[PDB]
Design a protein around this ligand. Sequence first.
Ligand SMILES: NC(=O)c1ccc[n+]([C@@H]2O[C@H](COP(=O)([O-])OP(=O)(O)OC[C@H]3O[C@@H](n4cnc5c(N)ncnc54)[C@H](OP(=O)(O)O)[C@@H]3O)[C@@H](O)[C@H]2O)c1
Ligand SMILES: CN(Cc1cnc2nc(N)nc(N)c2n1)c1ccc(C(=O)N[C@@H](CCC(=O)O)C(=O)O)cc1
Ligand SMILES: [Mn+2]
Length: 159
Amino acid sequence: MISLIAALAVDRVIGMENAMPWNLPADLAWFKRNTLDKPVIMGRHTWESIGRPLPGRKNIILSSQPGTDDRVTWVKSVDEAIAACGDVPEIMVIGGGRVYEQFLPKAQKLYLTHIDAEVEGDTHFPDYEPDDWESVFSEFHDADAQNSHSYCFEILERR
Ligand SMILES: NC(=O)c1ccc[n+]([C@@H]2O[C@H](COP(=O)([O-])OP(=O)(O)OC[C@H]3O[C@@H](n4cnc5c(N)ncnc54)[C@H](OP(=O)(O)O)[C@@H]3O)[C@@H](O)[C@H]2O)c1
Ligand SMILES: CN(Cc1cnc2nc(N)nc(N)c2n1)c1ccc(C(=O)N[C@@H](CCC(=O)O)C(=O)O)cc1
Ligand SMILES: [Mn+2]
C-alpha cells in the first residue's frame, strides 16, 4: 500500500527554497519511526536537500536523469518507482511537492504533521479532498524547549 508522509505548516506550505524552514526535532523522530525499515520514494530535489542516503531504508529517487550515486536506487517513472519497491506491505512517499502530487491518488494513507508556524514557502502540499479521508489517529503537542512550535501528528486513511 502506498502512504504519503509529510510535514505541513500554515497554509499547506512545505518548503522554501529547497529546505524546511522550521526545526522540529519531534517531527524527525516521528518521520524516522514511520519510515524505518521500509522503502522511501522521493523526488530529485528532495534527495538533494537530504544530501545522503537514509539508513535502514531503501532509498528510491525519481529523476528523468540518470543516477549519479550507487548508494541509492534511481527510477524514471512512478510505475517503475513502485515496482522497484518490491512486495512490501507499505511504501513511503516522502516528498517533495511534485512527487506528492503524483502519488496522492494512488495512496491509501496519510501521515501528516500539522505545524503551527507561519512561513512564506514556495512549495505546498496538494489540495486534497477531506471527504475522502478518515482521521484515525491524532495527537497534539505544545511547543517546548526542543520544539519551537506546537504541532500535531495525524493519520488518515482513505475511506
Ligand atoms: N515538509 C515536508 O515534509 C517535505 C518533505 C520533502 C520535501 N519538502 C520540500 O520540497 C521542496 C522540493 O520539492 P519539489 O517539488 O521542488 O521537488 P521534488 O518533488 O522532491 O523533486 C522534483 C523532481 O523529481 C523528479 N521527478 C518527479 N516526478 C517524476 C516522474 N514521474 N518521472 C521522473 N522524474 C520525476 C524530477 O527530477 P528531474 O528534474 O531530475 O526529472 C523533478 O525535478 C523543498 O523545499 C523540500 O524542502 C518538504
Ligand atoms: C530533507 N528532509 C525531508 C523531510 C523532513 N522532515 C519530514 N517530516 C515529515 N513528517 N515528513 C516528511 N516527508 C519529511 N521529509 C529530511 C532531512 C533529514 C532527515 C533525516 O536525518 N532523517 C533521520 C531522522 C533522525 C535524526 O535526526 O538523526 C532519519 O533517519 O529518518 C530526513 C528528512
Ligand atoms: Mn472504507
